[PDB]
Amino acid sequence: DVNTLTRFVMEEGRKARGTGELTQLLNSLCTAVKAISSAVRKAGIAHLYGIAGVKKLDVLSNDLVMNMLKSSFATCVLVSEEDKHAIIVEPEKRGKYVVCFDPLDGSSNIDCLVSVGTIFGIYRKKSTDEPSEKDALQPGRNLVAAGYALYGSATMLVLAMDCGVNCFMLDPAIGEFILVDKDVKIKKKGKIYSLNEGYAKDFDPAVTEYIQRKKFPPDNSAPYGARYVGSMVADVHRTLVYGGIFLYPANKKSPNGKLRLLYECNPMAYVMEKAGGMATTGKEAVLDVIPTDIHQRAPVILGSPDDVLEFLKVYEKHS
Amino acid sequence: DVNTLTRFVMEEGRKARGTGELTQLLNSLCTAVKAISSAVRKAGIAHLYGIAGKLDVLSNDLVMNMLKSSFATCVLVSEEDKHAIIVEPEKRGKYVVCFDPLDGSSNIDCLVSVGTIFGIYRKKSTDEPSEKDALQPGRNLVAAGYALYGSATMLVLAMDCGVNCFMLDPAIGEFILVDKDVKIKKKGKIYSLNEGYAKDFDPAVTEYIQRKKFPPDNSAPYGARYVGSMVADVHRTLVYGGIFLYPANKKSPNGKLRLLYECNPMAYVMEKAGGMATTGKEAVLDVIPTDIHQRAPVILGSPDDVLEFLKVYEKHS
Amino acid sequence: DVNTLTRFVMEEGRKARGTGELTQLLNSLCTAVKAISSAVRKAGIAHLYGIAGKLDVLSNDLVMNMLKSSFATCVLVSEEDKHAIIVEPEKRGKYVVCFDPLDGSSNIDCLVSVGTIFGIYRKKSTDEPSEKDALQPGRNLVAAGYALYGSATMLVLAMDCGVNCFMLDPAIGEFILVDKDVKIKKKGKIYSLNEGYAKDFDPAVTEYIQRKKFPPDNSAPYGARYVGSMVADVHRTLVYGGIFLYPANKKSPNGKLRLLYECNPMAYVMEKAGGMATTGKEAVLDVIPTDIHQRAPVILGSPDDVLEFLKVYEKHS
Amino acid sequence: DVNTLTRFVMEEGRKARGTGELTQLLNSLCTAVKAISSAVRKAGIAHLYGIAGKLDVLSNDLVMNMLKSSFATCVLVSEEDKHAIIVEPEKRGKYVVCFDPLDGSSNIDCLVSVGTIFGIYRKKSTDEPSEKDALQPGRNLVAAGYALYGSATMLVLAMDCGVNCFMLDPAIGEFILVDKDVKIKKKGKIYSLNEGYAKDFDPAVTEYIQRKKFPPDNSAPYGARYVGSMVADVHRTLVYGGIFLYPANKKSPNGKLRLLYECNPMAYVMEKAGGMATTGKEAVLDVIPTDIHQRAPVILGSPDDVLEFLKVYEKHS
Ligand SMILES: O=C(Nc1ncc(Br)s1)NS(=O)(=O)c1ccc(Cl)c(Cl)c1
Ligand SMILES: O=C(Nc1ncc(Br)s1)NS(=O)(=O)c1ccc(Cl)c(Cl)c1
Ligand SMILES: O=C(Nc1ncc(Br)s1)NS(=O)(=O)c1ccc(Cl)c(Cl)c1
Ligand SMILES: O=C(Nc1ncc(Br)s1)NS(=O)(=O)c1ccc(Cl)c(Cl)c1
């Protein structure tokens, strides 16, 4: 039987006999993802170029997500990569959910038409205070749901909840997300590692050794492949689909890494673990970090559990 | 003034006072690319999944059929077909086309960028057309380019008049001219190759890559990018500058990429954009192929970066 | 604040604190409409014509499969199916749906407007589900409406809360609420019927139309419009006011339009929009059907115009 | 073999060994039609309704701008513009175009069909371009046609080689040839006009229409259809046969429809398909216009039916 995102989420929401607020939010997010996809694919660009005789894509992506989440009545604190402060939903539109999102991740590299994406994490508001920015400072362990949209050769939405990970393919002819991969699980061990090796000069010594182990294996077995798109959603999704390891690790020049904990690292870690994978900073599980700043950075190394462990053994070797 | 791919090609063709045969070819290819783009973005996927109760084969069928029926071609070489296709007599025109209809399609399960690559030659003689007609060096290219099915769909067309970039507007099914007469940066800050094969590197590649990470003049190291789809990597090299390497090694002394419909059309685009493309030993466009599926090592991109690679290569003789 | 069909139905469903089964039904129906609209606009037609080397049956299969798989229905009546369809036990829900999946599709070769019409009943009896379940009078409707595949695709949904109009934005595949709680004009200036049957008209219809061309009060005559596709004619009537008539004639002594899936859903939308719908003898919504494909004469539209016709009807006993 | 409008026009242009200027025009027109179609189907409407926080004017702009930038035109006459538009010298070409960019847009609120009508003349003299270049009789048309934005979008193109119909595939933005060299039925079964204004009918129309409803023999009366949008009614007349009338009366002795960009292009299409088009006194294509916006009565369609109307018309003269 064919399944769409909206049918799937209404079905699970009825099994769980919830109020519907989470379902309303995901549906609002889904509309936003389709609007972003259409704009990323440059629909209507002919009008920018005078066919009949105007806002940047990440600004528009941010406006779309913000506006669709606010008007769902299901949220109260919204944190975006684009906004310094948490947005507090106005009283008449407030619901019980906190959302952290990157509206168009990888948009620095969009001039070359590389893959871009939207990342999101959804927390229940855990306190009875008046809603504030503090409500977004929960660890990834507390996520009710997370996922990402990938605007690649086709548009795919990956949704992770406590019942597992499911992949939906956008059918642009009818504007519906069709469930194509049910209950997804990552390979125990992959054959690809992914990181920016152009910065090897600054590598932590463990990262240098681990990558040396991938290119020059001690038992003279076959080397791993290298891939690095430079867009997290693209790189993380390839890890999920083919197995392997993705690294944006810490170094002495960037002791906490570069990616953001709330709206990049935590949702990707959540998808990974729900698929049977691992995600570490090296010192701790990504999801166990209690953030003190909504825009704080976190190092991340994720992928197949065996590949992340081998990096950890090398990491332990260098203390 | 707004410009479309079709309008642009008819204007240049009228300037040259040609017969229209190349214009008819390019328009058919333009149509094929739009069909491939629609399928690649998964239009109609709901019907595959039972809403009412392969992709590179379809891409090849799309390109094959639009070219055959364009009446401008006589020999078609595709990555998908071991032998050249000889167009049937009523449909023959004077052009040879070499193409990869969906380059990068092994890794489309992760939705990575894919693309179509093409190079167009003229028929080599008035005899009955044969596969030999596709064995010309890249220097003979009349036109070449690629479509990139990325976050958006873009067509890059390289002709003697230069390189122009068209963005597919999906709302109207038209290629809008967005980058006229495009030129690559003289020097970039990005290198692109699969470093997982570092065990097999030629010493010049080992040395050249070492200089990118540990610059002798204390400048900032290059960033690394490798999508693993040539069209994506080459297009990024064109747009941002840098260098793309798929070089020869001890296990593949002639490389991995195919010369006719991957290396040569990209080499032509690169040179037409002010960049360079070498095998290390010679310019790619100067290699005379003997087999339609022969491989070639390739190092392409910004001229200062390719020249710098060639100095290291000559250092190791 | 922007509103979509899915968002609207969920907001209304949670106000009512229902289980969601109706919302699941409507969402499945909306998806079928989007896919039907894509087929009507001929997306993918190029592949039928060999770019790589029936519409009402497809429309029926889309509505059938989406309703069956919604788990919300138990009896399905379609213009395309001789018998009611009984949903298999594991997929049964509490609703009966009667629909014309592609109304006007005989006259579609001229690209006339086409549409989907639907009416939704709660199953009223506790017997094992059967054809009898769809034989309820229109008064019992839970929801009804239509999709018009015209110059744009619009979905009209009438419920107890009134009539709402959603515009399909094809760029994102979403139904946008554009007309909230719509009410028809009290009196219009257009009449709509096939005047080619003037030879078979009953005296009251003959007289009513004569009054439209020759008003006794020297006011302006009404304009006439007749597309020949019920969704198009009724929707213009809803949007601009006026009157639509398909009375009985010698080829159709019980009228021509179908009671279950044409007259009742339109009568429901009209009355929820402040309009009227009569057979001449009784309200359409008060007709108790005995046969699922049975016909009814229909006169509907703005209330002043329908009353004016009814006054003429009583004049002739 | 699959055929597109662009491919078709290039093949026809090479048979005739023309310069390409007309082909550049039609291709520019085809692009404008696709953009118009996208807007009529309401793509991006979500943004108007605040998802992130003009239609006949846009149609006129799209056609004006695509014609100007084709380098194929010198005088442009539009229903939207009081005066003929003179293309600037540097963009001048040899053709005069008269068009209605969005005919029927008065009733577009009911989502009824709308359309673009166009007629293409060669400039006949070397004088400075002025309105006079647009005052040719329809006999001089080089090409004419219309786009119907209906249940699907179809482009009808009439030239000396006949009438051909192209279906827009929206998935790829391509007009697919679906009906080659079409001819209207010798006689139809449909009459089309606004019978609401029968009070003001010319007595000859009164008798003609009365004969369609009450045949003197035992044949079947005609059915009536009147969409109220000329492209829709005319296109149905083309596909199914019959007669479309927008005739003169004492209140409108020259009719209502405009001669240059409504009556003439349809007359040309009709005659190229084996149909007829008269004002009652003469063929529409024989009128020598004196004003770019002058009106002309039109009765067009199957030849047996127009001849029969002309018989009744002379009876009252
Ligand atoms: O949506 C609902 N209930 C509903 N009742 C009727 C309809 Br129709 S939907 N509850 S929910 O709390 O939003 C929820 C709970 C679990 C999951 Cl897994 C998801 Cl996705 C959503
Ligand atoms: O197309 C033409 N002639 C034409 N005449 C009228 C029209 Br309309 S097009 N010639 S051609 O050989 O195909 C050619 C030549 C140069 C370039 Cl640059 C390109 Cl693209 C194509
Ligand atoms: O849908 C629901 N409940 C829901 N709970 C959570 C969500 Br999310 S929806 N109930 S219903 O019976 O289907 C109904 C009732 C009234 C109307 Cl007006 C409509 Cl449309 C539908
Ligand atoms: O287009 C051309 N020539 C061309 N040369 C190369 C190409 Br490619 S097209 N000539 S034309 O005057 O525009 C013309 C003539 C007859 C028809 Cl029937 C049409 Cl459509 C158009």
mmCIF file of N, CA, C and O in Angstrom, chain A residues 163-223:
data_model
loop_
_atom_site.group_PDB
_atom_site.id
_atom_site.type_symbol
_atom_site.label_atom_id
_atom_site.label_comp_id
_atom_site.label_asym_id
_atom_site.label_seq_id
_atom_site.Cartn_x
_atom_site.Cartn_y
_atom_site.Cartn_z
ATOM 1 N N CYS A 163 9.925 5.444 16.882
ATOM 2 C CA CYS A 163 9.610 4.243 16.117
ATOM 3 C C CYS A 163 10.579 3.957 14.944
ATOM 4 O O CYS A 163 10.288 3.057 14.155
ATOM 5 N N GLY A 164 11.675 4.711 14.762
ATOM 6 C CA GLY A 164 12.673 4.433 13.732
ATOM 7 C C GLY A 164 12.792 5.543 12.701
ATOM 8 O O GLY A 164 12.256 6.641 12.865
ATOM 9 N N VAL A 165 13.556 5.257 11.639
ATOM 10 C CA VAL A 165 13.858 6.212 10.556
ATOM 11 C C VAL A 165 13.141 5.790 9.281
ATOM 12 O O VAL A 165 13.213 4.625 8.875
ATOM 13 N N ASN A 166 12.480 6.743 8.635
ATOM 14 C CA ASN A 166 11.826 6.497 7.360
ATOM 15 C C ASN A 166 12.152 7.597 6.369
ATOM 16 O O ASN A 166 12.153 8.779 6.722
ATOM 17 N N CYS A 167 12.358 7.197 5.114
ATOM 18 C CA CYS A 167 12.812 8.064 4.030
ATOM 19 C C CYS A 167 11.661 8.288 3.071
ATOM 20 O O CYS A 167 11.000 7.327 2.664
ATOM 21 N N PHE A 168 11.397 9.553 2.743
ATOM 22 C CA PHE A 168 10.329 9.921 1.818
ATOM 23 C C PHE A 168 10.890 10.662 0.604
ATOM 24 O O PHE A 168 11.671 11.612 0.749
ATOM 25 N N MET A 169 10.463 10.253 -0.589
ATOM 26 C CA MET A 169 10.897 10.889 -1.829
ATOM 27 C C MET A 169 9.833 11.874 -2.314
ATOM 28 O O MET A 169 8.667 11.506 -2.485
ATOM 29 N N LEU A 170 10.235 13.121 -2.558
ATOM 30 C CA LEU A 170 9.290 14.118 -3.059
ATOM 31 C C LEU A 170 8.927 13.828 -4.505
ATOM 32 O O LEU A 170 9.805 13.792 -5.374
ATOM 33 N N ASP A 171 7.644 13.571 -4.759
ATOM 34 C CA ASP A 171 7.148 13.474 -6.132
ATOM 35 C C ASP A 171 6.716 14.872 -6.547
ATOM 36 O O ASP A 171 5.641 15.348 -6.134
ATOM 37 N N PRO A 172 7.513 15.550 -7.383
ATOM 38 C CA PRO A 172 7.212 16.952 -7.701
ATOM 39 C C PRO A 172 5.982 17.112 -8.562
ATOM 40 O O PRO A 172 5.386 18.197 -8.555
ATOM 41 N N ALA A 173 5.552 16.054 -9.260
ATOM 42 C CA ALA A 173 4.355 16.146 -10.089
ATOM 43 C C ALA A 173 3.100 16.357 -9.267
ATOM 44 O O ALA A 173 2.163 16.999 -9.745
ATOM 45 N N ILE A 174 3.049 15.839 -8.038
ATOM 46 C CA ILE A 174 1.866 15.991 -7.195
ATOM 47 C C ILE A 174 2.183 16.632 -5.859
ATOM 48 O O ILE A 174 1.274 16.801 -5.041
ATOM 49 N N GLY A 175 3.447 16.949 -5.588
ATOM 50 C CA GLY A 175 3.795 17.575 -4.333
ATOM 51 C C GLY A 175 3.452 16.745 -3.120
ATOM 52 O O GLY A 175 2.839 17.251 -2.177
ATOM 53 N N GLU A 176 3.836 15.468 -3.129
ATOM 54 C CA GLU A 176 3.594 14.562 -2.010
ATOM 55 C C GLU A 176 4.863 13.764 -1.760
ATOM 56 O O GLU A 176 5.517 13.312 -2.707
ATOM 57 N N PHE A 177 5.182 13.574 -0.482
ATOM 58 C CA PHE A 177 6.342 12.802 -0.045
ATOM 59 C C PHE A 177 5.930 11.338 0.062
ATOM 60 O O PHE A 177 5.122 10.977 0.923
ATOM 61 N N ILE A 178 6.492 10.502 -0.795
ATOM 62 C CA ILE A 178 6.139 9.094 -0.878
ATOM 63 C C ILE A 178 7.139 8.280 -0.080
ATOM 64 O O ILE A 178 8.347 8.318 -0.355
ATOM 65 N N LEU A 179 6.622 7.497 0.863
ATOM 66 C CA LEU A 179 7.464 6.631 1.671
ATOM 67 C C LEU A 179 8.123 5.582 0.792
ATOM 68 O O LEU A 179 7.455 4.742 0.194
ATOM 69 N N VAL A 180 9.445 5.611 0.743
ATOM 70 C CA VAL A 180 10.192 4.710 -0.121
ATOM 71 C C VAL A 180 11.148 3.779 0.629
ATOM 72 O O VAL A 180 11.459 2.697 0.105
ATOM 73 N N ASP A 181 11.629 4.130 1.827
ATOM 74 C CA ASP A 181 12.509 3.271 2.627
ATOM 75 C C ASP A 181 11.966 3.245 4.042
ATOM 76 O O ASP A 181 12.039 4.259 4.738
ATOM 77 N N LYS A 182 11.410 2.096 4.448
ATOM 78 C CA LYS A 182 10.818 1.907 5.771
ATOM 79 C C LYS A 182 11.867 1.410 6.753
ATOM 80 O O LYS A 182 12.619 0.479 6.444
ATOM 81 N N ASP A 183 11.899 2.018 7.937
ATOM 82 C CA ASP A 183 12.655 1.501 9.080
ATOM 83 C C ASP A 183 14.109 1.221 8.693
ATOM 84 O O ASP A 183 14.570 0.087 8.637
ATOM 85 N N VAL A 184 14.813 2.291 8.416
ATOM 86 C CA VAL A 184 16.120 2.209 7.783
ATOM 87 C C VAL A 184 17.196 1.892 8.820
ATOM 88 O O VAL A 184 17.154 2.390 9.955
ATOM 89 N N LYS A 185 18.174 1.050 8.439
ATOM 90 C CA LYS A 185 19.293 0.703 9.317
ATOM 91 C C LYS A 185 20.629 0.853 8.577
ATOM 92 O O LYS A 185 20.759 0.440 7.421
ATOM 93 N N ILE A 186 21.625 1.456 9.242
ATOM 94 C CA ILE A 186 22.930 1.682 8.629
ATOM 95 C C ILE A 186 23.754 0.399 8.645
ATOM 96 O O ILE A 186 23.621 -0.445 9.534
ATOM 97 N N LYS A 187 24.613 0.253 7.641
ATOM 98 C CA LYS A 187 25.570 -0.843 7.610
ATOM 99 C C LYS A 187 26.409 -0.848 8.884
ATOM 100 O O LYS A 187 26.799 0.202 9.400
ATOM 101 N N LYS A 188 26.707 -2.043 9.382
ATOM 102 C CA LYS A 188 27.559 -2.151 10.560
ATOM 103 C C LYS A 188 28.952 -1.582 10.283
ATOM 104 O O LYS A 188 29.557 -0.933 11.152
ATOM 105 N N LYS A 189 29.442 -1.757 9.055
ATOM 106 C CA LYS A 189 30.750 -1.236 8.684
ATOM 107 C C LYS A 189 30.713 -0.810 7.219
ATOM 108 O O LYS A 189 30.216 -1.542 6.356
ATOM 109 N N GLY A 190 31.262 0.368 6.939
ATOM 110 C CA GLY A 190 31.267 0.923 5.609
ATOM 111 C C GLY A 190 32.646 0.870 4.986
ATOM 112 O O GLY A 190 33.571 0.248 5.512
ATOM 113 N N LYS A 191 32.765 1.529 3.826
ATOM 114 C CA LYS A 191 34.036 1.600 3.117
ATOM 115 C C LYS A 191 34.363 3.019 2.678
ATOM 116 O O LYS A 191 35.150 3.197 1.743
ATOM 117 N N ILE A 192 33.742 4.031 3.287
ATOM 118 C CA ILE A 192 33.994 5.420 2.902
ATOM 119 C C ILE A 192 34.148 6.283 4.144
ATOM 120 O O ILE A 192 33.291 6.251 5.034
ATOM 121 N N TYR A 193 35.174 7.133 4.150
ATOM 122 C CA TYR A 193 35.321 8.164 5.158
ATOM 123 C C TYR A 193 35.176 9.524 4.492
ATOM 124 O O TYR A 193 35.518 9.692 3.322
ATOM 125 N N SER A 194 34.713 10.504 5.267
ATOM 126 C CA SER A 194 34.294 11.795 4.735
ATOM 127 C C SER A 194 34.723 12.909 5.682
ATOM 128 O O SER A 194 34.168 13.049 6.777
ATOM 129 N N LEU A 195 35.672 13.728 5.234
ATOM 130 C CA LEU A 195 36.101 14.928 5.937
ATOM 131 C C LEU A 195 36.980 15.744 4.996
ATOM 132 O O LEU A 195 37.512 15.226 4.008
ATOM 133 N N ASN A 196 37.150 17.021 5.337
ATOM 134 C CA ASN A 196 37.955 17.957 4.556
ATOM 135 C C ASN A 196 39.427 17.749 4.877
ATOM 136 O O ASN A 196 39.967 18.350 5.805
ATOM 137 N N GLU A 197 40.095 16.928 4.056
ATOM 138 C CA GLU A 197 41.516 16.622 4.198
ATOM 139 C C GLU A 197 42.423 17.746 3.738
ATOM 140 O O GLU A 197 43.642 17.668 3.953
ATOM 141 N N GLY A 198 41.870 18.781 3.107
ATOM 142 C CA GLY A 198 42.702 19.910 2.765
ATOM 143 C C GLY A 198 43.239 20.630 3.972
ATOM 144 O O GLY A 198 44.239 21.346 3.860
ATOM 145 N N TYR A 199 42.582 20.471 5.123
ATOM 146 C CA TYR A 199 43.006 21.058 6.385
ATOM 147 C C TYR A 199 43.837 20.094 7.228
ATOM 148 O O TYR A 199 43.857 20.202 8.459
ATOM 149 N N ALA A 200 44.521 19.137 6.596
ATOM 150 C CA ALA A 200 45.274 18.151 7.367
ATOM 151 C C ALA A 200 46.363 18.785 8.231
ATOM 152 O O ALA A 200 46.731 18.222 9.263
ATOM 153 N N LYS A 201 46.859 19.960 7.843
ATOM 154 C CA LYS A 201 47.888 20.646 8.614
ATOM 155 C C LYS A 201 47.480 20.841 10.069
ATOM 156 O O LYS A 201 48.329 20.744 10.963
ATOM 157 N N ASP A 202 46.186 21.062 10.324
ATOM 158 C CA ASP A 202 45.639 21.364 11.646
ATOM 159 C C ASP A 202 44.990 20.169 12.343
ATOM 160 O O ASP A 202 44.380 20.355 13.401
ATOM 161 N N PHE A 203 45.102 18.960 11.790
ATOM 162 C CA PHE A 203 44.409 17.801 12.350
ATOM 163 C C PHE A 203 44.865 17.510 13.770
ATOM 164 O O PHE A 203 46.039 17.686 14.111
ATOM 165 N N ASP A 204 43.916 17.097 14.603
ATOM 166 C CA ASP A 204 44.258 16.418 15.842
ATOM 167 C C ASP A 204 45.092 15.189 15.491
ATOM 168 O O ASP A 204 44.850 14.557 14.463
ATOM 169 N N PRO A 205 46.093 14.839 16.296
ATOM 170 C CA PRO A 205 46.935 13.672 15.956
ATOM 171 C C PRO A 205 46.159 12.377 15.776
ATOM 172 O O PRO A 205 46.578 11.506 15.006
ATOM 173 N N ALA A 206 45.067 12.198 16.506
ATOM 174 C CA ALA A 206 44.262 11.000 16.325
ATOM 175 C C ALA A 206 43.593 10.985 14.959
ATOM 176 O O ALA A 206 43.481 9.925 14.329
ATOM 177 N N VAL A 207 43.124 12.147 14.492
ATOM 178 C CA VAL A 207 42.504 12.213 13.172
ATOM 179 C C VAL A 207 43.529 11.888 12.095
ATOM 180 O O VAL A 207 43.224 11.179 11.128
ATOM 181 N N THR A 208 44.750 12.424 12.229
ATOM 182 C CA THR A 208 45.822 12.069 11.301
ATOM 183 C C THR A 208 46.070 10.564 11.277
ATOM 184 O O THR A 208 46.162 9.959 10.203
ATOM 185 N N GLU A 209 46.158 9.933 12.452
ATOM 186 C CA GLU A 209 46.428 8.498 12.465
ATOM 187 C C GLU A 209 45.263 7.705 11.892
ATOM 188 O O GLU A 209 45.475 6.774 11.109
ATOM 189 N N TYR A 210 44.029 8.053 12.269
ATOM 190 C CA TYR A 210 42.884 7.284 11.797
ATOM 191 C C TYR A 210 42.787 7.317 10.276
ATOM 192 O O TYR A 210 42.621 6.272 9.635
ATOM 193 N N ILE A 211 42.939 8.507 9.678
ATOM 194 C CA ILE A 211 42.861 8.619 8.226
ATOM 195 C C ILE A 211 44.024 7.865 7.581
ATOM 196 O O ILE A 211 43.869 7.237 6.527
ATOM 197 N N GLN A 212 45.211 7.922 8.189
ATOM 198 C CA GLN A 212 46.312 7.098 7.700
ATOM 199 C C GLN A 212 45.932 5.622 7.715
ATOM 200 O O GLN A 212 46.304 4.872 6.802
ATOM 201 N N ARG A 213 45.168 5.188 8.729
ATOM 202 C CA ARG A 213 44.723 3.798 8.763
ATOM 203 C C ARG A 213 43.732 3.497 7.647
ATOM 204 O O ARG A 213 43.671 2.360 7.163
ATOM 205 N N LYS A 214 42.963 4.496 7.215
ATOM 206 C CA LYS A 214 42.030 4.268 6.125
ATOM 207 C C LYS A 214 42.721 4.235 4.765
ATOM 208 O O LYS A 214 42.339 3.428 3.913
ATOM 209 N N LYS A 215 43.760 5.060 4.549
ATOM 210 C CA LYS A 215 44.456 5.052 3.261
ATOM 211 C C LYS A 215 45.550 3.998 3.166
ATOM 212 O O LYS A 215 45.781 3.444 2.081
ATOM 213 N N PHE A 216 46.192 3.669 4.278
ATOM 214 C CA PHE A 216 47.326 2.750 4.300
ATOM 215 C C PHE A 216 47.034 1.737 5.398
ATOM 216 O O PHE A 216 47.631 1.775 6.479
ATOM 217 N N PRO A 217 46.106 0.820 5.152
ATOM 218 C CA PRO A 217 45.677 -0.107 6.196
ATOM 219 C C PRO A 217 46.840 -0.965 6.656
ATOM 220 O O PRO A 217 47.677 -1.377 5.837
ATOM 221 N N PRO A 218 46.950 -1.223 7.962
ATOM 222 C CA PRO A 218 48.100 -2.001 8.447
ATOM 223 C C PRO A 218 48.163 -3.417 7.896
ATOM 224 O O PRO A 218 49.266 -3.942 7.714
ATOM 225 N N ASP A 219 47.033 -4.051 7.590
ATOM 226 C CA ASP A 219 47.073 -5.398 7.029
ATOM 227 C C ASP A 219 47.145 -5.418 5.503
ATOM 228 O O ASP A 219 46.947 -6.480 4.907
ATOM 229 N N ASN A 220 47.413 -4.277 4.864
ATOM 230 C CA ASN A 220 47.541 -4.171 3.409
ATOM 231 C C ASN A 220 46.245 -4.533 2.675
ATOM 232 O O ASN A 220 46.262 -4.830 1.474
ATOM 233 N N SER A 221 45.115 -4.541 3.380
ATOM 234 C CA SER A 221 43.823 -4.718 2.735
ATOM 235 C C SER A 221 43.480 -3.459 1.923
ATOM 236 O O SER A 221 44.251 -2.490 1.859
ATOM 237 N N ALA A 222 42.314 -3.481 1.278
ATOM 238 C CA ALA A 222 41.943 -2.403 0.372
ATOM 239 C C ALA A 222 41.628 -1.114 1.133
ATOM 240 O O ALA A 222 40.916 -1.137 2.142
ATOM 241 N N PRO A 223 42.133 0.024 0.663
ATOM 242 C CA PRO A 223 41.807 1.311 1.288
ATOM 243 C C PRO A 223 40.337 1.674 1.152
ATOM 244 O O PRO A 223 39.626 1.205 0.259
#
